[model samples]
Target: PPRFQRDFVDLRPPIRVMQWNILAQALGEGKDNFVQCPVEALKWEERKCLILEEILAYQPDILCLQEVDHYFDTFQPLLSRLGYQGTFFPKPWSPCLDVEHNNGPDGCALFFLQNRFKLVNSANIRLTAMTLKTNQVAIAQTLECKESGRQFCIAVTHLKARTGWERFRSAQGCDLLQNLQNITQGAKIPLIVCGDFNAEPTEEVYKHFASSSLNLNSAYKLLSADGQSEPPYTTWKIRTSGECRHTLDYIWYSKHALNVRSALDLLTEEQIGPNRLPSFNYPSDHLSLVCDFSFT
Candidate 1:
């Protein structure tokens, strides 16, 4: 609770937004090998608690999540009781289904505090690559703050993963950008986009966003000394080949429309430990990102 205590208070409380790729329970147990992570630590019985606990700790007003396989059983029901209204968009063909004894198809789930904002519009997008729709998905919603009558659009997405998919990822990025342009009506409305792009800082998709017409800027960049580059890593894990650490996640906001007040501090290497992520303490390979923002 004290993590968010401000030295200089705002006239109105800043809108708290959270972005996370809460690893799918089925994939963690049945697929996507986390080499150093203990199998016991991936068990749903305890891991679900860790995931929920992480969310409860932040108490976000708007939450964007990816790889959610426990939507009906865990997230939707539990978050609903806490005054959150949510939207779920499952991938048309989730790889989670390939795993035996899976809960269901994993997908993206977006939520907002019902008491704070009224939903204006929402969209479920099946990301495309070279005109072909892919299994990855996204959720975009426009909401109006009840107290201030302010409007903003929030979106969450997970793009294609792994190597040999660079061009595919770039195409997907183009499709998403075009959709966003239409949704925001040429950057008239404030926009906040959260996603695991599955691409690195040097990737073409990253370049697309960097030069996009929406006038977007990555919020995490604020943590840098010069505030011009992204964090060194957003995800760190051990696969069969080797240790994998890369910056694949981001929270992008319209620079001219919103003011980023503060962002959550990431865990250091010592805090993550040698085993990397998806450990007993952390629920996902990718860390959750929280930011406090207000209209400029």
Candidate 2:
């Protein structure tokens, strides 16, 4: 049985969502990446197997992925067979340097089960007003459940990274929240947000959503492993660096509209062990986040 299976399944509007920063070709053909993993595992021929196996185990209704570059060639076809339709968004500045041109296979990806949810609409939420040259793009997809008339919006993103640039991340969050507010507020559509925020629960970057205007709340804060606020670490080792441990990933939902049904195994030492991901059988440097919701 899949991990997302629910008992007494009479369609109480239970929806499963999984969010992951699938690590792009940055880990695939990426030579500059510092983290060490088997070279064979770095190839899509073998690695997609690992990613697919893990995803099949959970088989969510809505899959939101960051750092997804090859959807048309591989992912979209594979997912289409599983009854999913996905859309891809490319980052404006995909490469840091022009010298390393075409270093692509970068951007965000979203896929929803066709039989379960119908795509009402989709949009790319821009996080910039000054310049459009950014990889900080969020996905906004409005979906309607096939079984019921219930509808909601699902989103995923990868924000500006590194320390010292707190203001940038905060600004991005505001752009995301404000756009979501515009989409969901008057229509009363529930918001399901996920992504690699690159900031912890304590940082002001994460606090940008705490404003009175946006009432979004983290699902991990409500039903995390053993009832802690969130897992101790979301990404322990980012590339070749040591102890970059921080809870930078998240799954937030419209507080009043969605009732949490269950939580997924966040992967403790018993699973991925106490080191970098892809260390054991994982595929990326970050762990995946999952949660189930029922319309309230």
Candidate 3:
């Protein structure tokens, strides 16, 4: 039985989207020190299965993923067999390479169900911060629904992590926003931007998206009772500093053009457990965010 299932508003099903920061395997094993997560749980062998099972469970039409270091040998080939067309953009200097025995540079990957949508155009953006290119990146693809013929732009990105880099993240946000504006031609096309922003709601980057000219709204906010707030935490794990819990991921959609029918609920704290993430069961420190939406 699936924990998250889509309930369509009409006979015709809506587009299902999934946003996730599937923790980069190399960094997870080599750099990220998940204090409580056993190293064996982070191994590629078993971990890959957990990642695949989660995606299969959701069955999204548009999938936006970050920290995908295994695009070639893993996701791309595997997902292609399942009818998904995907594109990957690696960071010019992925920190993953610094790790010993790393598979490859990790970056963002966007995939769409071929039978559901036709790719219109796509661009891979190397995010800039303060007028300087940053390691962060984003991918935007305009896709047309095969059935409805409606078109929309979907983007996926990941921003700088950790504290003391708030300003950098905000700058990166501005760059991406500017590119999206030009790409979408002033929001004439419906847009859905998903990312593991690595910033809390109070962060300037989050504020920028909330108040950008794009007319976007975080889709997961629909999960709240009032439908006006984000989840308590999207990533939770025990690190060197201590137990970290923060809402650093989002799925932003054009409020006027797309109607979010339903969103996957966040796992309860008890369900996440005291060990937090990257456990034997959950494959990533960041939880996957899934939503179902339709054209307005």
Find the candidate with the highest lDDT and give its number.
Answer: 3
Better of 2 and 3 by TM-score: 3
Q: Residue 251 in model 3: shift from native, Å?
A: 0.3
Error of 3 at 40 (Å): 1.4
Report how far residue 167 has shifted in candidate 1, in Å: 1.1
Q: Per-residue lDDT tens digits of candidate 2, residues 199-265?
A: 9888776777754355677776654444447777776554654556678899888778887777665
Taking the tens digit of each residue's C-alpha lDDT, what string does model 3 give over 217-273? 998877777778888999889988888888999999999999988777777776777
Candidate numbers, best lDDT first, in rank order: 3, 1, 2
Residue 113 CA error for candidate 3 (Å)? 0.6
Alpha-carbon runs more than 4 Å astray in model 1: 1-12
Kindly provide the TM-score of model 1 when superposed on the true structure, using C-alpha atoms. Answer: 0.95
Cα lDDT over the full model 2: 0.73
Model 3 CA lDDT for position 207:
93
Q: How much lDDT does candidate 3 score?
A: 0.90
Go through the candidates in order and give each one's C-alpha lDDT.
Answer: 0.89, 0.73, 0.90
Which pairs clash inside model 1? none
RMSD of each: 2.8, 3.9, 2.3
Candidate 3: regions farther than 4 A off:
1-12
